Amino acid sequence: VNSFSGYLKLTDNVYIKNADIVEEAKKVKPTVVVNAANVYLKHGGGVAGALNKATNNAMQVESDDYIATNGPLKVGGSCVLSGHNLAKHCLHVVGPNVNKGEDIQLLKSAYENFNQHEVLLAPLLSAGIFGADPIHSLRVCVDTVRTNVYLAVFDKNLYDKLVSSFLE
């Protein structure tokens, strides 16, 4: 049903909210929730861990089965799997891990995957353990994505910095 509420317009197609993406997916019933995935689809922490836990491990069983056919994803790549109870689809997207020397230029390729979907509920890619600057990631999102993306940012302090950087 894509019932997004309380999102701040940043640009004509990019919205942002200070919110837990798992609680957002349960209220919104989005067509697509984006996962911040790794190449092996092992959902052991962060957004990936949170989404998988909310599916009581359904997501992780489908993920393996996909890996069995494909082997690992490529950095900047993605796959469309079931959203289970959270969404119609989950778009598993791998951004570069700059801690491991993966190139920040691949963050554009990662966001390009969003353009295959009319409307997404998403985190910022390559943030957290992936080591990119979240404000940089928001700029790449705004520059690259032309479809409608509703970004959920868990941390109030980071949310306020993002909105300060974008609108002041």
Ligand X SMILES: Cc1ccc2c(C(=O)O)c[nH]c2c1
148 is a contact residue toward ligand X (CB under 6 A): no
87 is a contact residue toward ligand X (CB under 6 A): yes
Residue 121 and residue 24 in contact, taking contact as beta carbons nearer than 8 Å: yes
**Is 87 or 94 the residue whose CB approaches ligand X more closely?**
87
**What token pair was written down for 35?**
């996962």
**Residue 52 and residue 58: Cα distance in Å, rounded?**
7
Q: Which of 8, 29, 112, 142 binds ligand X (CB under 6 A)?
A: 29
Q: Which of 13, 18, 31, 147 binds ligand X (CB under 6 A)?
A: 31
Q: Report in angstroms how near the CB of residue 33 gets to ligand X at its nearest.
A: 9
Three-state DSSP at 93 gives strand
> Tokens 């920040």, residue?
104
161 is a contact residue toward ligand X (CB under 6 A): no
- Sign of CA pseudo-dihedral 87, 97, 166, 116: negative
**Residue 45 and residue 41: Cα distance in Å, rounded?**
11
**Is 37 or 87 the residue whose CB approaches ligand X more closely?**
87
85 is a contact residue toward ligand X (CB under 6 A): yes
**Is 76 or 83 the residue whose CB approaches ligand X more closely?**
83
Residue 34 and residue 22 in contact, taking contact as beta carbons nearer than 8 Å: no
**Is 90 or 107 the residue whose CB approaches ligand X more closely?**
90
Say how many C-beta atoms besides its own lie within 10 A of residue 121's C-beta.
Answer: 28
123 is a contact residue toward ligand X (CB under 6 A): no
Q: Report in angstroms how near the CB of residue 51 gets to ligand X at its nearest.
A: 12
141 is a contact residue toward ligand X (CB under 6 A): no
**What token pair was written down for 76?**
């900047």
**Is 29 or 136 the residue whose CB approaches ligand X more closely?**
29
**Residue 116 and residue 33: Cα distance in Å, rounded?**
13
56 is a contact residue toward ligand X (CB under 6 A): no
The residues of the shown chain that bind ligand X, judged by CB under 6 A, are 1, 29-31, 83, 85-88
